[PDB]
Scaffold this active site. Structure first.
Site, short mmCIF file in Angstrom:
data_model
loop_
_atom_site.label_atom_id
_atom_site.label_comp_id
_atom_site.label_asym_id
_atom_site.label_seq_id
_atom_site.Cartn_x
_atom_site.Cartn_y
_atom_site.Cartn_z
N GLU A 67 -18.89 8.18 -2.19
CA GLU A 67 -19.11 9.30 -3.07
C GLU A 67 -18.74 10.61 -2.38
O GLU A 67 -18.16 11.49 -3.01
CB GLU A 67 -20.56 9.34 -3.59
N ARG A 124 -2.65 -3.21 9.55
CA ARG A 124 -4.03 -2.84 9.19
C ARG A 124 -4.84 -2.64 10.49
O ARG A 124 -5.64 -1.72 10.62
CB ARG A 124 -4.68 -3.99 8.40
N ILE A 135 -2.04 8.24 11.71
CA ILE A 135 -0.58 8.29 11.59
C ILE A 135 -0.03 7.74 10.27
O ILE A 135 0.95 8.28 9.73
CB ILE A 135 0.10 7.57 12.79
N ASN A 179 -5.15 1.37 0.34
CA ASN A 179 -5.02 2.63 -0.37
C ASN A 179 -3.64 2.86 -1.03
O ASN A 179 -2.76 3.45 -0.42
CB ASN A 179 -5.40 3.83 0.50
N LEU A 222 -2.76 4.79 -3.49
CA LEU A 222 -2.53 6.17 -3.89
C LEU A 222 -1.69 6.97 -2.90
O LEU A 222 -0.80 7.71 -3.29
CB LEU A 222 -3.87 6.90 -4.09
N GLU A 223 -2.00 6.82 -1.62
CA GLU A 223 -1.41 7.63 -0.55
C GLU A 223 0.10 7.88 -0.67
O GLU A 223 0.53 9.03 -0.71
CB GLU A 223 -1.75 7.02 0.81
NI NI Z 1 -11.10 -3.33 10.38
#
Ligand code: NI
Ligand SMILES: [Cl-]
Ligand SMILES: [Cl-]
Ligand SMILES: [Cl-]
Ligand SMILES: [Cl-]
Ligand code: NI
Lengths: 353, 354
Positions: free
Chosen positions: A32, A213, A250, A274, A276-277
């Site tokens: 939030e 990741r 980065i 993500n 959107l980025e």
């Molecule tokens: Ni992790």
């Protein structure tokens, strides 16, 4: 272990006195807070901020964000007395509730003007009952507005989803043409390499920037790509057909470098990272079938013509080729300025008087 | 979301709670607490009707799949005198067992139900001083915590150990051969494990390594890495390989009994550790790397018990493996587990009798 702050919740701290007249913002937890942050940055300029949270997991994180608030305190326990003592100590000018913290005693027994943002309607009885208790509600869809208006809520509007606001950062410039694959898991790496291998038959100068990741896997990833027959290099060094990134952060800064982005957590059953980025930079994003954890974002991108789901190596090749030959126009960022603008407008007006 | 917060129910507990009068009330804040208490609940469930409450919305769906271990399910009432008293008036519970902590002030102050705190530890905070004495019985992890609570004027405080250390083995699997079992292994852990195992096979040529990735999506990758090390590989059920990959979800805990030594991952990469306990319940020693910061109580328990061994590099791993292969290490974790369980269960049954 973790600090539950039960005493503070039950008997709010006397030192809240020192924050009287502030704007009270409640972010249940880290999510939030991040969602509301772009709005908070602007409001923090015109108001003193009293920030509360519910999850004990948010304390430590929020302490690192002291730049964005003046006072930090957990939400009072949900009984008339703890809540009233909180309000009487802090004498807040208003309370903004991010998303849906329907705490009955909090909503029923405080007099503070109350504002709900980024809300959606479920049609539940607790909504029927508490929605009318807010002085202003800003919802994600006009559909949600309709439902709440039938609940006798006045002052209800749609401004869009706050989660879709671009938070871009500086970004990086690199010469060459690139595809950028970000937040890629071990189980996603081979399908992407095999797709990029099929592509390079056609686009000989094209390079893949590959961002694991977990940056720790930057070496396993390299060896794989090498096993596949790619010249490889590690970021900074751009010599390779596949360029691996081993430095943390980065990733959000790399996207503008590419023509097309691929975002992981989606080709394996992770639920999507993500999406959107990249699109905030006017670049289309490709992802696999496993988007269940980012579903609203998925449906948004598809509607904006900026996101593309691929089921397998072949569809990936096909989609990449389509986007390399025809530049897909992306307008996510204008939508972002639009949502942000609407929210900030209504709030400033409400707060004015 | 799409998750049910059940605010209305918490505020105004359901009338149907009536149909569960005189039950034992067990509160498990979320999934973790429930699983921690499960072995005790299984026994109490034989002698008591069970009213089960939870705090986290994230537990609801999970708990619905556990309908075999309770009679009624309902979220904890909101923390105001009226909701709590309404919950209590409707359900007339015989007692309330709170698992771990959950110091909900209105709950504790305004109910008359006899209250029991289980698996607790002492932080020494002011809220502890104030609420601890309101429990009729408190069962704690250490005798050290007991002493602190005793000084808060709690009467009826004992230590029975950490419920989290109770073995929950399962059926188990049998296979012919000699194995080492590496479970919950991440991509970044595979090479130190393979390097160490290559060294060991020089001496124990018949030894086989059963290798269970943290995520099965990484299995093909793991198998190929084993091949690069020059190992013959095979996928589970086929015991052909020097290295045998596991391809099915679950399975892991049932495999451990097959081995002479277990290796548990999330520990050679900065992850913080997976379930070190499971192999030791089979009287098998477990080895892990330095990154056990998310299972540090468990890590300490295993070390003191002589069943857990921290290794920092490939050499210490080879060293520790060879030691454990040449001289069999006696493991008494299961013994400790029956002890902790029996103690908890003894005290509880006695309190509930009268
Ligand atoms: Ni992790
Ligand atoms: Cl009321
Ligand atoms: Cl009343
Ligand atoms: Cl009530
Ligand atoms: Cl009542
Ligand atoms: Ni996982």
């Amino acid at each position: 272990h973790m600090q539950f702050e039960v005493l503070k919740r039950f008997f709010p701290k006397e030192s809240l006195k020192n924050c009287k007249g502030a704007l009270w913002v409640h972010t249940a937890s880290i999510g939030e807070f991040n969602t509301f942050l772009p709005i908070l940055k602007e409001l923090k300029r015109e108001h003193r901020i009293l920030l509360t949270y519910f999850s004990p997991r948010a304390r430590e994180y929020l302490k690192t964000k002291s730049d964005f608030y003046d006072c930090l305190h957990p939400l009072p326990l949900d009984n008339p007395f703890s809540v009233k003592r909180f309000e009487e100590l802090s004498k807040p000018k208003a309370l903004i509730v991010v998303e849906r913290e329907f705490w009955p005693s909090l909503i029923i027994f405080t007099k503070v003007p109350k504002i709900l943002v980024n809300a959606y309607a479920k049609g539940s009885l607790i909504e029927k009952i508490l929605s009318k208790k807010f002085d202003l509600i800003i919802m994600r869809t006009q559909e949600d507005v309709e439902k709440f208006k039938t609940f006798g809520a006045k002052r209800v509007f749609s401004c869009g989803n706050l989660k879709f606001i671009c938070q871009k950062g500086k970004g990086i410039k690199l010469k060459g043409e690139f595809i950028v694959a970000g937040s890629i898991h071990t189980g996603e790496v081979e399908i992407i390499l095999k797709a990029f291998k099929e592509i390079k038959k056609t686009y000989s100068s094209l390079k893949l920037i590959l961002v694991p990741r977990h940056i720790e896997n930057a070496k396993i990833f390299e060896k794989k790509a090498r096993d596949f027959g790619f010249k490889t290099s590690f970021f900074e060094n751009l010599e390779g057909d596949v360029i691996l990134v081993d430095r943390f952060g980065i990733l959000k800064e790399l996207y503008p470098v590419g023509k097309i982005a691929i975002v992981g957590g989606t080709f394996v059953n992770i639920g999507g990272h993500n999406l959107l980025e990249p699109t905030c930079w006017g670049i289309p994003v490709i992802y696999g079938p496993y988007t269940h954890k980012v579903n609203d974002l998925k449906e948004f991108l598809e509607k904006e013509g900026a996101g593309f789901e691929v089921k397998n190596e072949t569809e990936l090749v096909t989609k990449l080729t389509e986007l390399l030959s025809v530049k897909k126009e992306i307008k996510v960022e204008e939508k972002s300025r639009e949502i942000k603008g609407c929210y900030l407008e209504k709030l400033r007006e409400f707060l004015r008087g």
